């Protein structure tokens, strides 16, 4: 199955209220495995998954230094972006940075990406071919130019096609137990009502890995993505995920309603109705 | 006992292609990269590039991107360092070494023994042997020195015995020299007693297997 | 490279010498350092790995560290066998590649300072007949090594095609070079008698030949 490693970085200006916040996290698939909090007392890159714990001091000392050198840059970049957009220092703004590599089931490189965003909006993005840049506005053009002068795209291409996948492959076989599993969902359905006009049919899918899952209702083949109360796939906390999809249905018409579950751990896509 | 065995030493003409090899053993070949280190004569180590044989991905230092190609063969546990056009300045020692990551571990835990590469315009040519006489008249040294002169030969090396191997003591064959002509020249002296200049006779046996030449030469003084 | 090693280090048997290795935030700063040892005439060997660890076959007198952008190898109690080239090496983030330092040649100062034993041959009668000629200054037997040569015709710095070797060690543990001079009979005859002076540790050691 496909696997991917992603690094997420957030910095927000807190004017007159101490240092800018800076949070970094590392995921493999949907499993976090490292963190660095600028406010944390340790000032260290720390492990957040059992299989990353065996990495030696080399690793923690080295990453620790890189992530600090990151925060130092982002502290400045907040200043720089206020200048591009001519903004006062009284407000709080948000820099976001995500990069990572996607590999297929043969653990071969598929896709690299590395994207920035200011105040929730897409700011600048590395392309699919890992050479050009997408720069949204005036301000990002000023960043793009500096990143062509400083041959940044080429630095990233070498990381994504090289060291990124090289270490995703490490993390996978080290956390083979965790990352290469597919726990399939335990599925049940609840029927509950308050009035007589209608009852609500809810379709559950619990403790399953990875988070990718599809839940859809129907009235004999027709997509009932209508009264389709659908909650975001959420974490259980034990490394698995949860999701349910609900419909409210006129009484006594639970026969025609069925819920389709589709997941990587299910041989046949699993169907169920109320009993 | 993990190991790295490299191809034999090479002498080549500029513009020829050349692919040296590095075979591994005693470890899982696909789990580790093979890299490739240059050491110019008299100088230190330079990293050239590497290949991850697991996935065939292969990278290079900026100095060497485009001058060489570094591939591998998972099945035969062989890594390769390959030129298309050799320069004269490609003449150096080339080491391979097994490394697992680019991090962070890191480190070239086993190294190959080294492959020596020589590149020269010069054509394969045998030497000219010349004699070098002693000061026969003397004044109780009580020794006196004589020898042979090997000149204008390519490539290295030559063997120089004396009396067809009868003379071991006294013999000292000197390291050759590299001319601006491109050809080598060395000398082999042998310090003997002065009294034995009366009876004994000396021929130096110069052999150059590359050029396929065998030459003897007697040595004597003169008016 | 952007990582720098002093070329020379020295000590008597039993002394301690560190070998500095000085890089930058992108190589030695954020990545690990490893040290390799090269007894000359051999491939290099892994000496210290992970900044500061020792492979199984490396004695504990070797020890390494790493602070900031500088890493140091410490050889604590030198031996004869330890004189070799020493190389630090770190991954550089700007180059996506390793960079070695230029190396540090380590000497142990036991052996005594022996003097050279020169032999100077003139051109042979045969070589003359080929419209050619070669004088031959052969040296041999001397520690420490690396010397310069000089030729004088009448008595002036001649340099008419002087080729000289590297020192390179002998089987007896001393060093030995050779120097060759070229010129046609016209220079060999017209001049008085060529000298070849071999200086080794402020020591004039010259031998001369005539055309007679």
């Amino acid at each position: 199955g496909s696997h991917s490693m992603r690094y997420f970085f957030t910095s927000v200006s807190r004017p007159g209220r101490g240092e800018p916040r800076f949070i970094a996290v590392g995921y493999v698939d949907d499993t976090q495995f490292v963190r660095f909090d600028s406010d944390a007392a340790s000032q260290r890159m720390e492990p957040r998954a059992p299989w990353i714990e065996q990495e030696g001091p080399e690793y923690w000392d080295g990453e620790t230094r890189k992530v600090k050198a990151h925060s130092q840059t982002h502290r400045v970049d907040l200043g720089t972006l206020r200048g591009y957009y001519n903004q006062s220092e009284a407000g709080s703004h948000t820099v976001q940075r995500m990069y990572g590599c996607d590999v297929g089931s043969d653990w071969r490189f598929l896709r690299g990406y590395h994207q920035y965003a200011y105040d929730g909006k897409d700011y600048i993005a590395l392309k699919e071919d890992l050479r050009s840049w997408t720069a949204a506005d005036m301000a990002a053009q000023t960043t793009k130019h500096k990143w062509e002068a400083a041959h940044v795209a080429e630095q990233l291409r070498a990381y994504l096609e090289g060291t990124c996948v090289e270490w995703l492959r490490r993390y996978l076989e080290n956390g083979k137990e965790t990352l290469q599993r597919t726990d399939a969902p335990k599925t049940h359905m609840t029927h509950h009502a308050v009035s007589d006009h209608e009852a609500t049919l809810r379709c559950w899918a619990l403790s399953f890995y990875p988070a990718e899952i599809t839940l859809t209702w129907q009235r004999d083949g027709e997509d009932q993505t209508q009264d389709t109360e659908l909650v975001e796939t959420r974490p259980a906390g034990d490394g698995t995920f949860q999701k349910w999809a609900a419909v409210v249905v006129p009484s006594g018409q639970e026969q025609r309603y069925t819920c389709h579950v589709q997941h990587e751990g299910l041989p046949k896509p699993l169907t169920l109705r109320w009993e | 006992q993990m190991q790295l065995v490299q191809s034999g030493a090479e002498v080549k003409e500029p513009g020829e292609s050349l692919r040296i090899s590095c075979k591994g053993s005693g470890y899982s070949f696909t789990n580790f990269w093979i890299s490739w280190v240059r050491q110019m004569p008299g100088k230190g180590l330079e990293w050239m590039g590497r290949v991850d044989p697991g996935y065939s991905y292969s990278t290079y230092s900026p100095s060497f991107q485009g001058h060489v190609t570094i591939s591998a063969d998972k099945s035969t546990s062989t890594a390769y360092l390959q030129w298309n056009s050799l320069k004269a300045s490609d003449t150096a020692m080339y080491y391979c070494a097994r490394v697992q990551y680019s991090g962070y571990y890191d480190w070239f835990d086993p190294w190959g023994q080294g492959t020596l590469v020589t590149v020269s315009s010069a054509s394969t040519k045998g030497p000219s042997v010349f004699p070098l006489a002693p000061s026969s008249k003397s004044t109780s040294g009580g020794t006196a020195a004589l020898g042979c002169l090997v000149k204008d030969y390519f490539p290295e090396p030559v063997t120089v015995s004396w009396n067809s191997g009868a003379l071991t003591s006294g013999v000292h064959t000197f390291p050759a020299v590299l001319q601006s002509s491109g050809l080598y020249s060395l000398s082999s002296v042998v310090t003997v007693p002065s009294s034995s200049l009366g009876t004994q006779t000396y021929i130096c046996n110069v052999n150059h297997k590359p050029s396929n030449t065998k030459v003897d030469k007697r040595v004597e003084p003169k008016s | 490279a952007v990582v720098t090693q002093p070329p020379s280090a020295s000590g008597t048997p039993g002394q301690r010498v560190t070998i500095s290795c000085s890089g930058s935030s992108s190589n030695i700063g954020s990545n690990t350092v490893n040290w390799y040892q090269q007894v000359p005439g051999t491939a290099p060997k892994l000496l210290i790995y992970s900044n500061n660890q020792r492979p199984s076959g490396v004695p504990d007198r070797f020890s390494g560290s790493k602070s900031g952008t500088s890493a140091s190898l410490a050889i604590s109690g030198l031996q004869s066998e330890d004189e070799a080239d020493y190389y630090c090496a770190a991954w550089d983030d700007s180059l996506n590649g390793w960079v070695f330092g230029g190396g540090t040649k380590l000497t142990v100062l036991g052996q005594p300072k022996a003097n050279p034993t020169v032999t100077l041959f003139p051109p042979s009668s045969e070589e003359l007949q080929a419209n050619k000629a070669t004088l031959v200054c052969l040296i041999s037997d001397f520690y420490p090594g690396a010397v310069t040569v000089a030729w004088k015709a009448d008595g002036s710095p001649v340099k008419a095609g002087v080729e000289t070797t590297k020192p390179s060690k002998q089987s007896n543990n001393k060093y030995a070079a050779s120097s060759y001079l070229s010129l046609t009979p016209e220079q060999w005859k017209s001049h008085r008698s060529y000298s070849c002076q071999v200086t080794h540790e402020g020591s004039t050691v010259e031998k001369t030949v005539a055309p007679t």
């Binding site: 690094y7 690793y59 992530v67 840059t73 960043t143 990381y159 | - | 992108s26 954020s30 983030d93």
Partner: peptide
């Protein structure tokens, strides 16, 4: 393993 640089905007 992180990308070692945070390039300046």
């Amino acid at each position: 393993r992180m990308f070692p640089n945070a390039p300046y905007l």
